[PDB]
Amino acid sequence: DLYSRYKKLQQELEFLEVQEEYIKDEQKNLKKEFLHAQEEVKRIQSIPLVIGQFL
Amino acid sequence: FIVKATNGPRYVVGCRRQLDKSKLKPGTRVALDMTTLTIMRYLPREVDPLVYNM
C-alpha cells in the first residue's frame, strides 16, 4: 500500500515548490505596482496649490 | 513660493529656471501665468495713477 503514497505526496511537494517559487516574484512585482501607485500619489501636488483654511 | 494676487485667493507655485530667487523679497510685485500660474518675471512696484493725477 506504500507505492501509492509517494506517488501522491511527491507530486504535492513539487507542485508546492512550483508555487513557492512563484509567489516570491509575485510579492516582488506587487512592490513595483506599489511604487507606481506611490508616484500616482506624489503627482497630486506639483504645479498648483490653492490655499484655504481648515474649518 | 507663497503669493497672493490682488483679485482674490492665495497660491503656491515656483520659478521657471532663471528667476533669481534672492530678488524675491517678501512683498515684491511679480507676474504669473494665466493657465500654468507659475511665476514669470519679477516686476517693479505699482504706481496707482490716482497718485499721478496729483
Short description:
It is classed as hydrolase. The structure is cut from a larger assembly and holds chains A (about 55 residues) and B (about 55 residues). Chain A is mainly α.
Task: Map the helices and strands.
The structure is cut from a larger assembly and holds chains A (55 residues) and B (54 residues).
Chain A: H1 5-42, E1 50-51
Chain B: E1 2-4, E2 10-12, E3 29-32, E4 39-43
Antiparallel strand pairs in B: 1-2, 3-4
Structure description:
Chain A: It is found in: Cytoplasm; Nucleus. Chain A: Belongs to the AAA ATPase family. The structure is cut from a larger assembly and holds chains A (55 residues) and B (54 residues). With 55 residues, chain A is mainly alpha-helical. Chain A has one helix and one strand. The longest helix of chain A has 38 residues, at 5-42. In chain A, 0% of the residues are buried. Chain B has strands spanning 2-4, 10-12, 29-32, 39-43. In chain B, the strands form two sheets. A two-stranded antiparallel ribbon of chain B has the order 1-2. Chain B has a two-stranded antiparallel ribbon with strand order 3-4. Chain B is mostly beta strands and 54 residues long. Chain B is globular and about 40 Å long. Classes of the chains: A mainly alpha (55), B mainly beta (54).
